Amino acid sequence: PVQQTGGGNYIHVPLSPRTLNAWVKLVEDKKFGAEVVPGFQALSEGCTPYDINQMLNCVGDHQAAMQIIREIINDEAADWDAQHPIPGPLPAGQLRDPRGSDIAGTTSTVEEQIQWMYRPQNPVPVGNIYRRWIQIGLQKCVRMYNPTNILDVKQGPKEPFQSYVDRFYKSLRAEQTDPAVKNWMTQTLLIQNANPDCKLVLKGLGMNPTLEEMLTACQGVG
Amino acid sequence: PVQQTGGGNYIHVPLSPRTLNAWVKLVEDKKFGAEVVPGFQALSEGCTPYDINQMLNCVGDHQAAMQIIREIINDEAADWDAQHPIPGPLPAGQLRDPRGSDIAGTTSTVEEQIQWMYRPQNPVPVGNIYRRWIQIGLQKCVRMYNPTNILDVKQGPKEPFQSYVDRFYKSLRAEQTDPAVKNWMTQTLLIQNANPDCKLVLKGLGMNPTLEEMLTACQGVG
Ligand SMILES: O=P(O)(O)O[C@H]1[C@H](OP(=O)(O)O)[C@@H](OP(=O)(O)O)[C@H](OP(=O)(O)O)[C@@H](OP(=O)(O)O)[C@H]1OP(=O)(O)O
Q1: Where is this protein found (chains A, B)?
Q2: Whether the CB of B3 sits within 6 Å of ligand 1
Q3: Residue A129's closest CA among A90, A87, A98, A173?
């Protein structure tokens, strides 16, 4: 992370060992589950690219997922090296502008990452861009390791409607389908895959029942 | 039918044999079913009374129904001979105005029917008036031969709600009851005679559910 010091300059404070150990624990227990994507973001907040590399280096043993996060990073960096091209011959005595690889931290020092992150002129938020690239990689890992598909989720005959709602929305988090497909699933598939009685109360509510109206109506049905 | 020819005058083109044979087929297969009433209208469009008589003469063997269509025609002609009385002594060299019997074509030539149908002054649409009289006769035949009464129609335990709706409305077409009785049947009897589950979803919808709302709610119930 970065702390400001007297003179208006900034320095690097290494991520706490227990901040790194929390990340490890999460990846070892949730197995790249939907929750890992937000868990990574909260534990990587205010981090330079250098620190994000260490967090990944602490969870490298999960090689399959790391290979997926690594192929997504290279592509989001290539797109940065195509749409943010070298401006031209950089003047001497000046830091080069960041390339996709600098945003990652692989070809750049943490100080360079800090100089960009806090440029008085055109600050480049290299830490947040790289966290966004890794979140695309982790979300692809959440989908690949997702244990139950949205379609398979079906309310148990006795299962309370809210727990069936809880499992239905958790699988939808993994789904990478178009947002309209997500809206049609929450409005059509969720009434389609409910136990016989809850299905009669939901159809009873009428057309386009909101989730609050559906949860309120099926509370204690079954 | 009637075609216009050079000089501004009109002539008669005999109904096609296959237009007449379609009519026969329909009456022989639908057995004066609700569908016969519209089927007659489409196959009698732009016909003089003379042609409508031939269509009836092609389906005379159905004597019982023909006797009903014939008693309705005589009464709709008597009402025309009472409310459209002979104006008075007709001038010589002029076509007499049409009487109920002329509208039928029984006491009138097709040319007279055409002269009225296309009078430059007060054209009388004898072909359409007679088609309307026969439709009253066929509709009475649809009701007399109707196999299932609106009340008897009751959704099967597994029957999809739409098929029960299809049979319920087909019997209502035969019903000659006041329109309010028709509106109360479609809004009350249709929910009353549905299988136990669909009846619970329809009551669930609330008061005065539209048919679209009822079909949408019971789709896939049972
Ligand atoms: O009504 P018909 O006396 O039996 O004649 C019909 C009629 O032709 P006309 O319009 O000249 O009367 C058909 O037209 P429609 O009345 O059905 O619209 C036409 O068929 P098209 O729709 O293609 O015009 C068909 O001609 P064909 O079946 O040879 O294609 C022809 O029937 P016939 O000549 O066989 O008697």
Answers
A1: Virion
A2: no
A3: A98
